[PDB]
Enzyme design. Sequence first.
Site, short mmCIF file in Angstrom:
data_model
loop_
_atom_site.label_atom_id
_atom_site.label_comp_id
_atom_site.label_asym_id
_atom_site.label_seq_id
_atom_site.Cartn_x
_atom_site.Cartn_y
_atom_site.Cartn_z
N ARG B 241 0.60 -0.61 -0.05
CA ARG B 241 -0.23 -0.31 -0.09
C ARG B 241 0.70 0.98 0.02
O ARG B 241 2.20 1.09 0.11
CB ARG B 241 -0.99 0.40 0.95
CG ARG B 241 -2.13 -0.64 0.57
CD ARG B 241 -3.09 -0.10 0.54
NE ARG B 241 -3.83 -1.38 0.35
CZ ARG B 241 -4.22 -2.02 -1.18
NH1 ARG B 241 -3.71 -2.22 -1.97
NH2 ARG B 241 -5.29 -2.70 -0.74
N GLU B 270 -3.69 8.18 -5.39
CA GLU B 270 -4.06 7.38 -6.34
C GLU B 270 -4.95 7.51 -6.95
O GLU B 270 -6.68 7.95 -6.93
CB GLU B 270 -4.36 5.58 -6.20
CG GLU B 270 -3.61 5.06 -5.30
CD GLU B 270 -2.84 3.63 -6.00
OE1 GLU B 270 -4.28 2.83 -5.98
OE2 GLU B 270 -1.40 3.27 -5.14
N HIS B 288 -0.68 0.72 -9.53
CA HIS B 288 -1.04 -0.73 -9.21
C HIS B 288 -2.30 -1.85 -9.80
O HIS B 288 -3.10 -1.97 -9.69
CB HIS B 288 -1.96 0.59 -8.36
CG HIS B 288 -2.91 -0.66 -7.16
ND1 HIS B 288 -3.40 0.35 -5.55
CD2 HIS B 288 -2.49 -1.69 -7.12
CE1 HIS B 288 -3.78 -0.91 -5.03
NE2 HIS B 288 -3.56 -2.12 -5.71
N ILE B 289 -1.20 -2.48 -10.14
CA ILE B 289 -1.93 -3.15 -11.32
C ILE B 289 -1.02 -5.07 -10.81
O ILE B 289 -0.95 -6.04 -11.70
CB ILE B 289 -0.88 -3.67 -12.86
CG1 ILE B 289 0.24 -3.20 -12.59
CG2 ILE B 289 -1.61 -1.28 -13.73
CD1 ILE B 289 1.09 -2.52 -14.27
N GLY B 290 -0.77 -4.51 -9.12
CA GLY B 290 -0.71 -6.22 -9.35
C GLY B 290 -0.78 -6.93 -9.24
O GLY B 290 -0.36 -8.44 -9.21
N1 LIG Z 1 0.36 -4.24 -5.06
C1 LIG Z 1 -0.90 -4.77 -5.49
O1 LIG Z 1 -1.77 -4.97 -7.02
C2 LIG Z 1 -1.66 -6.02 -4.29
C3 LIG Z 1 -2.04 -6.72 -4.56
C4 LIG Z 1 -3.01 -7.56 -3.88
C5 LIG Z 1 -2.85 -7.37 -2.24
N2 LIG Z 1 -1.95 -6.22 -2.26
C6 LIG Z 1 -1.69 -6.05 -0.76
O2 LIG Z 1 -0.97 -6.69 -0.23
C7 LIG Z 1 -1.45 -7.18 1.11
C8 LIG Z 1 -1.58 -8.47 1.62
O3 LIG Z 1 -1.74 -8.96 1.68
P1 LIG Z 1 -1.72 -10.50 1.89
O4 LIG Z 1 -2.87 -11.26 1.00
O5 LIG Z 1 -0.02 -11.34 1.73
O6 LIG Z 1 -2.37 -10.55 3.15
P2 LIG Z 1 -1.91 -11.48 4.19
O7 LIG Z 1 -1.35 -12.40 3.84
O8 LIG Z 1 -3.28 -11.20 5.75
O9 LIG Z 1 -1.06 -10.25 5.41
C9 LIG Z 1 0.58 -10.45 4.92
C10 LIG Z 1 1.43 -10.40 6.17
O10 LIG Z 1 1.26 -8.80 6.82
C11 LIG Z 1 2.33 -9.01 8.45
N3 LIG Z 1 2.23 -7.47 9.41
C12 LIG Z 1 0.50 -7.50 9.14
N4 LIG Z 1 1.02 -5.99 9.82
C13 LIG Z 1 2.19 -6.43 10.03
C14 LIG Z 1 3.07 -5.74 10.51
N5 LIG Z 1 2.42 -4.49 11.69
N6 LIG Z 1 4.24 -5.60 10.99
C15 LIG Z 1 4.96 -6.86 10.11
N7 LIG Z 1 3.88 -7.57 9.61
C16 LIG Z 1 2.75 -7.74 9.81
C17 LIG Z 1 1.12 -10.72 8.67
O11 LIG Z 1 1.67 -10.83 9.29
P3 LIG Z 1 0.31 -11.86 10.25
O12 LIG Z 1 -0.29 -13.20 9.81
O13 LIG Z 1 0.82 -11.81 12.25
O14 LIG Z 1 -0.33 -10.37 11.15
C18 LIG Z 1 1.01 -11.34 7.18
O15 LIG Z 1 2.18 -12.26 7.34
C19 LIG Z 1 -2.98 -6.47 0.65
O16 LIG Z 1 -3.78 -6.39 2.30
C20 LIG Z 1 -3.38 -5.54 0.24
O17 LIG Z 1 -3.16 -3.89 0.55
C21 LIG Z 1 -1.81 -5.38 -3.15
#
Ligand SMILES: NC(=O)c1ccc[n+]([C@@H]2O[C@H](COP(=O)([O-])OP(=O)(O)OC[C@H]3O[C@@H](n4cnc5c(N)ncnc54)[C@H](OP(=O)(O)O)[C@@H]3O)[C@@H](O)[C@H]2O)c1
Lengths: 333, 333
Positions: B241, B270, B288-290
């Site tokens: 983000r 954005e 933002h095309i992830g």
């Molecule tokens: N750029 C793009 O197009 C795109 C696409 C998809 C997603 N995203 C972003 O990627 C994010 C993560 O996706 P995901 O599916 O991987 O979510 P996720 O698996 O729920 O979260 C990934 C990791 O973040 C850790 N975390 C949360 N808060 C933290 C903190 N304060 N300090 C250190 N680690 C922390 C979580 O640990 P815990 O299990 O211990 O809570 C988890 O291991 C999404 O929420 C979104 O913001 C971007």
Amino acid sequence: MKPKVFITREIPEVGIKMLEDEFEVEVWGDEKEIPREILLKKVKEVDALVTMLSERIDKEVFENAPKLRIVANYAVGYDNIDIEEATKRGIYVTNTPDVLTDATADLAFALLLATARHVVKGDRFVRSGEWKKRGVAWHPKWFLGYDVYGKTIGIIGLGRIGQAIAKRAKGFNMRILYYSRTRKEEVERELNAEFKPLEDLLRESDFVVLAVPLTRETYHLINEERLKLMKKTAILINIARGKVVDTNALVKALKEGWIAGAGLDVFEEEPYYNEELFKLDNVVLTPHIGSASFGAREGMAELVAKNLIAFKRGEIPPTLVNREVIKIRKPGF
Amino acid sequence: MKPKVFITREIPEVGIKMLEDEFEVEVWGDEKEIPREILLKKVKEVDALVTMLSERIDKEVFENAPKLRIVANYAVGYDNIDIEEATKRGIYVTNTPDVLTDATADLAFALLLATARHVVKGDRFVRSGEWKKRGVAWHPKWFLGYDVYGKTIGIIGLGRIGQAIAKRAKGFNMRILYYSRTRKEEVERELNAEFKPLEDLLRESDFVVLAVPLTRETYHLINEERLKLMKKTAILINIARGKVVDTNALVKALKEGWIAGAGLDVFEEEPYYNEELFKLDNVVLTPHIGSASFGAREGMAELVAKNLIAFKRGEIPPTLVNREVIKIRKPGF
Ligand SMILES: NC(=O)c1ccc[n+]([C@@H]2O[C@H](COP(=O)([O-])OP(=O)(O)OC[C@H]3O[C@@H](n4cnc5c(N)ncnc54)[C@H](OP(=O)(O)O)[C@@H]3O)[C@@H](O)[C@H]2O)c1
Ligand SMILES: NC(=O)c1ccc[n+]([C@@H]2O[C@H](COP(=O)([O-])OP(=O)(O)OC[C@H]3O[C@@H](n4cnc5c(N)ncnc54)[C@H](OP(=O)(O)O)[C@@H]3O)[C@@H](O)[C@H]2O)c1
């Protein structure tokens, strides 16, 4: 340090320094390739020669260099040298394999990913301000690209670079198909790579990556006919040599939807310009930077010094290309 | 198909079709985000709501939506929704995890390699004709970039995307470090990933990749202080983000050489424009095309339909975010 050596371009200083105490070193200093006129003149009293891919080291060269007993190319490829004419004159020809392998495979994957997902185009969109202008933040159907993980990659030339590329593909859990002159089962086993005749590899692959030297056989291997075998969704990646692909056939396929896009690091003429190709949005281009990593270019510099220094001491060059010259004459000056 | 649902943007048709026969589907047809004015008006009689990352689904929205009992976000992240206010009003909030994991990991690695090897820059150089114009074909010291294979990568947030990114890193024989809220032994074992306090991960990593959700804690996690901790050779990759990074600090680090470059897919605002950042040659940007791969976006559409259709049949949504609402009210309209 009687041995004279002329380096046609300024390679990393580490190689230069390595040769200092063993050779009398002279180096071309302009960034553009050295004019033939000057070159023919500088190679008169030289024992060793360090050339670049871009320079054509043919018979005419070997003629104007009566004392030249070793030509160390600063590249792994060597299609710029007339190796046959050199083995004849008892001239050893070395290259720089392995030291640049990872950088080149790293770049091949960068191209594969950049093309599949439109990073160049998306960057232009953001950087130009166009994205801001449009007032649209995120859209479900914008810049839709192709998946890489789990897909089928077909490596054409499963050699040192090809194998490095396959090792990375495993990290993307891809199904690995490959076409090559022979099958090395120990390699097929370690990489889980499956041999396929070229036609099958082109038919079943989502990504086709070229990694073969340029030869009589590989010349225009990717023609208008083979381009039709590929899927309309497939992407072609060329980090081998520009002439392994028929640019015209390629430009047609891209405009006609025969394939989805291309990532090109090499071209038939370098530098290169082609208005048609360059107008295309599904093409990603880089100026032959395959081995351009600090580590790789440094390793190449050091490997060249090793070859020239071993030859001085009456030893077979660690990375000798034409070993058939060991007969015509032995190592030395 | 009594249930009414309003999708705020045209998601892939496969999702719409799935809902068509179970719901009364209306969809915002413009490409730009729907004005709040119109939105408030459209949610009056809706039971379900399908929103995008760009839309802020706060209290004001939940008010003007008396019947709204389920909001399916068309994203894995959900910092755009006031989940607290929703669980209060007995409104179920779902997201689309896993289906877009691979596409995002794929893009994350595409940024990593493009920034490391100057892909975007090289393309502009070639495409603009500048390469041809200058007359140099191949030069030992041109576009020198950083090696990836064998290097150390530090994943900040080892979740679904983070783990996918680590699986690919294995393909590049990278040493995998990672900072995250907890340690999952089975995961460390499968990926060979080693935990490291944030500070150590920043000093030891050649590539730092952000993959954490946006929260109070992660807000500006990458500030001017932590950027000073990174190597001057390191590269930062943000596909999480925009606000997990202090842009100003980042722009400073980049101009000052505190770090080598950045690959950015997300921004604090954005769309985004910033002349300082965009002038920089060691930065790669994408809008933002992830998750923008055909498969990912299609799977997200189908997952959103599965969630809405399960809630209708009186079942707990498969990817229910706020499970604490299971108490406030049971599944149904
Ligand atoms: N750029 C793009 O197009 C795109 C696409 C998809 C997603 N995203 C972003 O990627 C994010 C993560 O996706 P995901 O599916 O991987 O979510 P996720 O698996 O729920 O979260 C990934 C990791 O973040 C850790 N975390 C949360 N808060 C933290 C903190 N304060 N300090 C250190 N680690 C922390 C979580 O640990 P815990 O299990 O211990 O809570 C988890 O291991 C999404 O929420 C979104 O913001 C971007
Ligand atoms: N773009 C860049 O910056 C960059 C950088 C480095 C190298 N390159 C190019 O990459 C080429 C290969 O590099 P490398 O170190 O991997 O060399 P390599 O290992 O010697 O060659 C790779 C493979 O090509 C196969 N091959 C040769 N001719 C073939 C043919 N006619 N049909 C099918 N397969 C064929 C070889 O098979 P067999 O040996 O079994 O016959 C070998 O398995 C270099 O020669 C150079 O042109 C480009």
